[PDB]
Design an enzyme around this catalytic site. Sequence first.
Site, mmCIF file in Angstrom:
data_model
loop_
_atom_site.group_PDB
_atom_site.id
_atom_site.type_symbol
_atom_site.label_atom_id
_atom_site.label_comp_id
_atom_site.label_asym_id
_atom_site.label_seq_id
_atom_site.Cartn_x
_atom_site.Cartn_y
_atom_site.Cartn_z
ATOM 1 N N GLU A 40 0.821 -1.190 0.000
ATOM 2 C CA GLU A 40 0.000 0.000 0.000
ATOM 3 C C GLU A 40 0.869 1.260 0.000
ATOM 4 O O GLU A 40 2.075 1.220 0.273
ATOM 5 C CB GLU A 40 -0.964 -0.078 1.183
ATOM 6 C CG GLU A 40 -2.006 1.003 1.312
ATOM 7 C CD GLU A 40 -3.004 0.977 0.175
ATOM 8 O OE1 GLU A 40 -2.676 1.482 -0.920
ATOM 9 O OE2 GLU A 40 -4.021 0.261 0.311
ATOM 10 N N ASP A 42 -2.158 -5.263 1.047
ATOM 11 C CA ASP A 42 -1.560 -4.107 1.696
ATOM 12 C C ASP A 42 -0.139 -4.355 2.168
ATOM 13 O O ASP A 42 0.647 -3.408 2.233
ATOM 14 C CB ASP A 42 -2.387 -3.618 2.902
ATOM 15 C CG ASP A 42 -3.749 -3.083 2.507
ATOM 16 O OD1 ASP A 42 -3.786 -1.992 1.909
ATOM 17 O OD2 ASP A 42 -4.777 -3.598 3.016
ATOM 18 N N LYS A 67 -14.623 -8.470 3.498
ATOM 19 C CA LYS A 67 -13.296 -8.565 2.894
ATOM 20 C C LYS A 67 -13.032 -9.976 2.393
ATOM 21 O O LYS A 67 -12.436 -10.173 1.326
ATOM 22 C CB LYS A 67 -12.209 -8.168 3.898
ATOM 23 C CG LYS A 67 -11.238 -7.099 3.411
ATOM 24 C CD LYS A 67 -11.829 -5.709 3.521
ATOM 25 C CE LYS A 67 -10.753 -4.614 3.447
ATOM 26 N NZ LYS A 67 -10.196 -4.423 2.080
HETATM 27 O O1 LIG Z 1 -6.507 -0.638 -1.618
HETATM 28 C C1 LIG Z 1 -7.648 -0.331 -1.558
HETATM 29 C C2 LIG Z 1 -8.519 -0.430 -0.312
HETATM 30 C C3 LIG Z 1 -8.031 -1.186 0.787
HETATM 31 O O2 LIG Z 1 -6.746 -1.774 0.809
HETATM 32 C C4 LIG Z 1 -8.876 -1.323 1.884
HETATM 33 O O3 LIG Z 1 -8.540 -1.921 2.835
HETATM 34 C C5 LIG Z 1 -10.154 -0.755 1.888
HETATM 35 C C6 LIG Z 1 -10.577 -0.051 0.760
HETATM 36 N N1 LIG Z 1 -9.747 0.086 -0.317
HETATM 37 N N2 LIG Z 1 -10.174 0.896 -1.440
HETATM 38 C C7 LIG Z 1 -9.457 2.188 -1.276
HETATM 39 C C8 LIG Z 1 -9.483 2.627 0.229
HETATM 40 C C9 LIG Z 1 -8.375 2.494 1.133
HETATM 41 C C10 LIG Z 1 -8.477 2.867 2.460
HETATM 42 C C11 LIG Z 1 -9.660 3.381 2.954
HETATM 43 C C12 LIG Z 1 -10.742 3.518 2.116
HETATM 44 C C13 LIG Z 1 -10.638 3.147 0.766
HETATM 45 S S1 LIG Z 1 -12.204 3.397 -0.142
HETATM 46 C C14 LIG Z 1 -12.224 3.107 -1.939
HETATM 47 C C15 LIG Z 1 -11.017 3.922 -2.447
HETATM 48 C C16 LIG Z 1 -9.757 3.498 -2.134
HETATM 49 C C17 LIG Z 1 -8.648 4.273 -2.569
HETATM 50 C C18 LIG Z 1 -8.844 5.446 -3.315
HETATM 51 C C19 LIG Z 1 -10.157 5.864 -3.616
HETATM 52 F F1 LIG Z 1 -10.375 7.002 -4.336
HETATM 53 C C20 LIG Z 1 -11.248 5.113 -3.177
HETATM 54 F F2 LIG Z 1 -12.514 5.514 -3.461
HETATM 55 C C21 LIG Z 1 -9.790 0.432 -2.761
HETATM 56 C C22 LIG Z 1 -10.529 -0.762 -3.356
HETATM 57 O O4 LIG Z 1 -9.702 -1.321 -4.342
HETATM 58 C C23 LIG Z 1 -8.707 -0.539 -4.995
HETATM 59 C C24 LIG Z 1 -7.716 0.192 -4.066
HETATM 60 N N3 LIG Z 1 -8.350 0.080 -2.756
HETATM 61 MN MN LIG Z 2 -6.643 -2.545 3.178
HETATM 62 MN MN LIG Z 3 -4.979 -1.719 -0.104
#
Ligand SMILES: O=C1c2c(O)c(=O)ccn2N([C@@H]2c3ccccc3SCc3c2ccc(F)c3F)[C@@H]2COCCN12
Ligand SMILES: [Mn+2]
Ligand SMILES: [Mn+2]
Length: 178
Positions: A60, A88, A114
């Site tokens: 990450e 991550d 998840k």
């Molecule tokens: O890597 C992640 C991710 C996680 O690793 C996670 O734990 C929860 C959620 N994620 N999501 C993250 C993210 C990370 C941490 C907290 C909330 C969010 S909410 C959606 C969003 C994310 C990143 C940028 C963005 F503009 C988003 F709208 C997206 C899901 O897929 C691709 C990357 N990712």
């Molecule tokens: Mn995560």
């Molecule tokens: Mn992530």
Amino acid sequence: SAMEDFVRQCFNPMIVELAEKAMKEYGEDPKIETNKFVAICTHLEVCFMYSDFGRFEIIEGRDRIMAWTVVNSICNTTGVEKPKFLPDLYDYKENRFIEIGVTRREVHIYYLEKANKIKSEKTHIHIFSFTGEEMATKADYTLDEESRARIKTRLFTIRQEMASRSLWDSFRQSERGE
Ligand SMILES: O=C1c2c(O)c(=O)ccn2N([C@@H]2c3ccccc3SCc3c2ccc(F)c3F)[C@@H]2COCCN12
Ligand SMILES: [Mn+2]
Ligand SMILES: [Mn+2]
């Protein structure tokens, strides 16, 4: 927005800059999705803390290309199966990829969500709440208890600063949709 101000006041500039880049990648505006902005900052900080908790490579907080370069390097040298989605962290001691989750909801719900998403038993899941609760795959919490304590303390502190600014209720109801 008071939330954007809180994010920029309580989080490290490196964290904020990385969260803003992630948001740009997915076409989200940190000025409108301010609650997500803070969610992304919080989880970035958890992941960095977890990693320094060792032992861990961080996936990450990197851009897609470099992140998949690191994942593939790991899969080539260790032979661990390539994950289907960016994880991550990678644990070199237990030689497994780790997905970190941070929730304002019950940890068991977020864990189930998840696990249904990744659908790969191989990747380890570790869910943290903002009130000291945690759920991890096979109740293998990976880290020692001092390390998890430091993470849990930082998350609670963030919740209480938000609460101090009357921002916690909005933040909490933003995680799940209707
Ligand atoms: O890597 C992640 C991710 C996680 O690793 C996670 O734990 C929860 C959620 N994620 N999501 C993250 C993210 C990370 C941490 C907290 C909330 C969010 S909410 C959606 C969003 C994310 C990143 C940028 C963005 F503009 C988003 F709208 C997206 C899901 O897929 C691709 C990357 N990712
Ligand atoms: Mn995560
Ligand atoms: Mn992530």
